[PDB]
């Protein structure tokens, strides 16, 4: 029930098994047995050794579209306000565009007297 370690081969080293290797540069390694240890010492790469966990996941041995947008209240207008504004669609919107044109048309007639 001690800390569970992992080897050069990626295997799981139970307590009382293998050896631990402390290099001069400060890195510490643990090997499950002398086979994994000798492979590590001879500088063999575990990605090229077939029975190694690193090799197996490297070669993968054995192993949609979404989006949503939600309406929110925006400071100065509750969700009710925006819905009512965007529900002016059934010609209420068209009613508002056309009164602005005539509300600027008579101003244009005043502007004609102001321009000229």
């Amino acid at each position: 029930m001690k800390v569970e370690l992992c080897s050069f081969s990626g295997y799981k080293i139970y307590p009382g098994h293998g050896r631990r290797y402390a290099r001069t540069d400060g890195k510490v390694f643990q090997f499950l047995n002398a086979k994994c240890e000798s492979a590590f010492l001879s500088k063999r790469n575990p990605r090229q050794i077939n029975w190694t966990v690193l090799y197996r996941r490297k070669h993968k041995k054995g192993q949609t579209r979404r989006a949503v947008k939600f309406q929110r209240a925006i400071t100065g207008a509750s969700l009710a306000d925006i819905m009512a504004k965007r529900n002016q669609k059934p010609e209420v919107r068209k009613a508002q565009r056309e009164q602005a044109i005539r509300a600027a048309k008579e101003a244009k007639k005043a502007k004609q007297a102001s321009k000229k």
Binding site: R72, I74, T75, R86, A100
Partner: protein
Amino acid sequence: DIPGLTDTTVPRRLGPKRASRIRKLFNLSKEDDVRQYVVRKPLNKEGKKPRTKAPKIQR
């Protein structure tokens, strides 16, 4: 509802600014009084009169 989490929804601090991002939010077609439909944020400070503040709309 999770207590204190799925309630008292916080509003987006401030609405759209580009003249097209307001049209998509409010289904503006074309020249339907685009200026007025922009959200006008009200400001309420105790040591001052109440007043609402509108932003400059781009494009």
